[PDB]
């Protein structure tokens, strides 16, 4: 019970989460464990925290109305790693390489 | 908020200085397609975006929000991903370019 | 119809030649507030239109229609009646780029 | 009874029809006499007939919605002078002439 839209972004989400993506997608795959890593700013500065498994659980729900939805939440994503984070941190470079796939996936969706 | 679109433009004015000249040229001024050869460019791209283009909306004060340059930005980003096969040029020039865009844009205060 | 627009096309080409460019030149591109400085223009004129936006929606297939074409071209020379007074030289020179206009706009077929 | 916009419309008309404009405005205080003039194709290349009494009768009338639709039956007037007329013809002069007054004046609008 999906649109065609909705199910090219099942597709997105499911390239993004294999194999051949893991060594720039890991750090995306769970929320941020920001307590555990000592980033007591974390939440003062991230007020809206997201990670594909959040998108995974969301796609299962059909909670998605459309693929601009889907588009807003892995976006959210990327732009909390960059708010938080300095240029020159791994986790950057990691966020600019996993979004460049699911950019161009994304505009190569059907009209 | 106002204050929201004054750093909208000064992030507009980072993509069109100097340092980021190498990989930004191709997004200054609208894809000429016929000078390319490119016959099918406005048949898959049915609403062209640029930064001149984005430049002007700016100094009209077209755009409401923040949101809204955004959603032109990646327009313009989205429109070059969906044309071109991923080894072409373009394509990795448009993501140096979309790399300074998205993080200046998530520093943004809000 | 594509051929209204067509003829669309070609009034607007007719406006860039050279024939026209001793009075059309202010009109190619937007007017360039800081240029000129000028601190109300965008304050007075919400919706700045000039020959070469024209030219971009044309060449996007943006107009639906021929009155879309020429609402825009009319928003134009309004824009500059608005802001200036009678007796400024671009005044003079949109009315005369405005009499090529109106008439080839006239001349349509159906 | 009337809005600020289509009052401001109403003092455009009065100002079209002042001797003031007497020399280029007479040819449209009243239709084209066609018989008279021996034009026996005008009303098959002109199919809306308008002329500034029409426009007069109608803000007599109430009969306008808003200053668009004032601007489009003016703008008609010009157009069916332009589109019957080859551009070296006096009344094509004198119908510029008019339209200056006019799209000037209309720009100046509330
Ligand atoms: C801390 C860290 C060191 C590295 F060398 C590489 C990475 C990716 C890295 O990032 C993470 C590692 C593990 C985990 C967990 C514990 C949740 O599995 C998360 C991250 C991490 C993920 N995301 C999305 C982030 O935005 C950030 C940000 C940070 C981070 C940690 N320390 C900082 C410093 C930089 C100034 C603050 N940023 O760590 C992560
Ligand atoms: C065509 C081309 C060859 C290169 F080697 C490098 C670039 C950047 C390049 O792209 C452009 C070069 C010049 C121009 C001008 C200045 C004429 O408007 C535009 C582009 C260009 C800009 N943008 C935003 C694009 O999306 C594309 C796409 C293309 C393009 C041209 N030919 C193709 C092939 C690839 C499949 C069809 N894609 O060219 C541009
Ligand atoms: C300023 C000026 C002096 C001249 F002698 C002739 C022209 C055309 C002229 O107008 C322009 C000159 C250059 C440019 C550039 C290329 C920078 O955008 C624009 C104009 C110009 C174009 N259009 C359509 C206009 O409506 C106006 C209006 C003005 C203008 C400048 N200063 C005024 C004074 C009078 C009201 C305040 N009006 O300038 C332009
Ligand atoms: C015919 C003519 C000769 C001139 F030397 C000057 C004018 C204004 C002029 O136009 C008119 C003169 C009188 C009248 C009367 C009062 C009889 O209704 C009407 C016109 C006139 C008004 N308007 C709005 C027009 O569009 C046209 C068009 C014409 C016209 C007459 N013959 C032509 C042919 C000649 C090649 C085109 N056009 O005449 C008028």
Same mark, same amino acid.
């Given at each position: 019970? %999906?649109?065609?839209?909705? $199910?090219?972004?099942?597709? #997105? ?7 051949? &993506? ?8 769970? /929320?941020? =464990? ?8 974390? &939440?003062? #500065? #991230?007020?809206?925290?997201? =990670? %594909? ?22 976006? %959210? ?12 941190? =791994? ?5 600019? $390489? %996993? ?10 969706? /059907?009209?």
């Amino acid at each position: 019970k %999906l649109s065609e839209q909705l $199910k090219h972004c099942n597709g #997105i989400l499911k390239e993004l989460l294999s194999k051949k &993506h893991a060594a720039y997608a890991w750090p995306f795959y769970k /929320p941020v =464990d920001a307590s555990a890593l000592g980033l007591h700013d974390y &939440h003062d #500065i #991230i007020k809206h925290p997201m =990670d %594909l498994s959040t998108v995974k659980r969301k796609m299962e729900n059909r909670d998605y109305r459309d693929a601009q939805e889907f588009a807003a939440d892995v976006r %959210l994503m990327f732009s909390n790693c960059y708010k938080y984070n300095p240029p020159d941190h =791994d986790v950057v470079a990691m966020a600019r $390489k %996993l979004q460049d796939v699911f950019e161009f996936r994304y505009a190569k969706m /059907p009209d």
